[PDB]
Symmetry: C3
Subunit: 239 residues, 3 copies
Amino acid sequence: SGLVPRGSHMMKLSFHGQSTIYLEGNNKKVIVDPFISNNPKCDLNIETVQVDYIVLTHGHFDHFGDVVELAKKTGATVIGSAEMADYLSSYHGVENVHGMNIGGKANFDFGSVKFVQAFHSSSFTHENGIPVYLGMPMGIVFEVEGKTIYHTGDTGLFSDMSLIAKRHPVDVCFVPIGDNFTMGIDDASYAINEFIKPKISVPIHYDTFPLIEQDPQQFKDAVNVGDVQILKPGESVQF
Amino acid sequence: GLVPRGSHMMKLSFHGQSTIYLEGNNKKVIVDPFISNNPKCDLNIETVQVDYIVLTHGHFDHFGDVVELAKKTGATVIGSAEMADYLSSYHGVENVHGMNIGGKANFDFGSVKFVQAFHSSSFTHENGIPVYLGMPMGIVFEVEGKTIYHTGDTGLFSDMSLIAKRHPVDVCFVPIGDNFTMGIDDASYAINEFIKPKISVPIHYDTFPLIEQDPQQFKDAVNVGDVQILKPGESVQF
Amino acid sequence: MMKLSFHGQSTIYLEGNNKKVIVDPFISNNPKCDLNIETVQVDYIVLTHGHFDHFGDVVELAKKTGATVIGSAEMADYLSSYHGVENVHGMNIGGKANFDFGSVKFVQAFHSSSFTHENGIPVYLGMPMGIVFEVEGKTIYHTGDTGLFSDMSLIAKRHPVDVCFVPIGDNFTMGIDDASYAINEFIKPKISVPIHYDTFPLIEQDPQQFKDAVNVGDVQILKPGESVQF
Ligand SMILES: Nc1ncnc2c1ncn2[C@@H]1O[C@@H]2COP(=O)(O)O[C@H]2[C@H]1O
Ligand SMILES: Nc1ncnc2c1ncn2[C@@H]1O[C@@H]2COP(=O)(O)O[C@H]2[C@H]1O
Ligand SMILES: Nc1ncnc2c1ncn2[C@@H]1O[C@@H]2COP(=O)(O)O[C@H]2[C@H]1O
Ligand SMILES: [Cl-]
Ligand SMILES: [Zn+2]
Ligand SMILES: [Zn+2]
Ligand SMILES: [Zn+2]
Ligand SMILES: [Zn+2]
Ligand SMILES: [Zn+2]
Ligand SMILES: [Zn+2]
């Protein structure tokens, strides 16, 4: 316990399938949208994953994923909408939640989390077929170890992507390309070129299901600003 | 062995509230089928033929007869992921296709792209507890070379210009009823400043006393394209 | 002088043509609220959204005063059918209605809207909203609980604003930086009042940092019970 915490390195930021990202800030571990056990393309394993924090963009099954079991096993704090925190706390018995809402910023030991708007939906559907409403869907702006990371969440194209990116210039943007349920290739590449203009773009939310199969090279070819890193599950952003 | 019917003026009609009907590649599509409980609606649940039902949002005056119409016709119901789950799991609808805002899907009639809207989306059970059915939406269709923008139930928003610049619009269906949506002034502003379609059709008025409007005031206020004030049963003229 | 007062969190009160209006009546459960449920007089209750800290004492206040509750379709249906409130008027975003007090127009917001029943299952109550009032020749924009959005400029350009009530608490809404940007860049009202801070430890802020950051019009840091000075 007398050992000094591990010193600085290249910021750790990895993609794990669908909308799942993992990052470390000040030796704390953060995961977004942990769809691990039910995504066969996800390289993570809920028995071995180490996390201090879980952040949810919205409540759909392919983002909510293993949050309850993961939080209960790790003691991780779950960060989400006010509705998401009350649902996790009062319906699922998750002990450590932090409710926020759009535009809200919070400072944690790992860095900062700010929720931003998205155009999508947010619910988890129960056995009777009734969606449970879990707030407006959101994107995330992280400030971690000097890096600004914008995870758009599941979203359609919107011009305030430019307002988010102007007010919070972006090192890394994770942007969905799968179409049907989100932007496709054309809208995502327009989002990056016209509005966000990050240093690095990573396409997300494709191939997990047949309906959202896409060739991410068509995204790369359409992006004219910064660098595109087409990450396979398990791969880290190179800064 | 007969070849399917060949090409004609694109078939596109208005049926009261926000109900529109269109044909693409000999497939029949209805939006927001509020038929049996809208006495101003010219259609009849027992006779209307549809291959697809598209829902902009869950409110009773749009959801309407979707369950009984889908059951009779075998039509595919296209809507939000929440609307697809609810219809399929709670109501037993056989054929659903879930989507979400910004998603585009290709069907045998043409394409459906859902876009954003500012409103609400639920269906209220008897006990006063809404069933959440996603964010409200508009629709961009591409059918037989025509781009149709149905704005859904919505307030005015500047990204109407983004939608229209990215998908230049042949016909825009825009609500004018006020109280629950844009009224005359906001809808005409939407058309003049943001959407700039070839043809505008005002919708979502007169169905209930609270949303009675003179659509001529909308026509008078619009300075771009053509305005066609359609009565229930009337077709857009191209 | 038009009567317009702040009462803690996002609660405002105004009078138009002798009719009394309250927004987001979080009275009994806000120890900083100067009002008392048993003695507030109102003809109208307007709700930006369903959260406990806005919904507040709406059912009790409505049942006691006979006030008409103005909100989203979903809020009017829930209050009427679930809570048995006698007098509701359902509206939705972009809609305007004319009352004897003046007009109410709901506008967009970025937040959430529900009231949580037992077991952490929310009752959906629509999209969250702001309000544009026109009352005794004054345009009042209550942004509701919201994040920053550029259509704040569209709302303000189409409805030039005398008074803007804008949240600064952060975590659940805009903080100081985003609110002052909203006022300076988008809304540019005659008078800005910060709201939705200090009620709970998480949303404690110094409203003086908001006043210092605002370069347009006049900032009035109202304490609960104080009136806007025209
Ligand atoms: N609750 C759920 N749990 C697991 N898989 C689901 C659930 N809901 C939908 N899916 C699947 O997830 C897929 C995503 O979109 P598809 O249309 O490809 O088909 C969907 C279903 O097969
Ligand atoms: N769930 C519902 N089912 C049937 N009619 C409804 C429902 N909700 C509202 N209405 C009626 O539809 C009308 C819409 O406009 P009004 O608010 O004037 O009055 C409303 C009611 O008369
Ligand atoms: N439904 C509720 N009823 C009463 N208090 C609540 C409710 N929801 C949240 N709170 C409290 O309100 C506080 C708002 O700020 P905090 O997030 O710090 O902590 C929150 C809770 O302690
Ligand atoms: Cl915008
Ligand atoms: Zn989703
Ligand atoms: Zn998703
Ligand atoms: Zn509606
Ligand atoms: Zn409607
Ligand atoms: Zn709130
Ligand atoms: Zn609040």
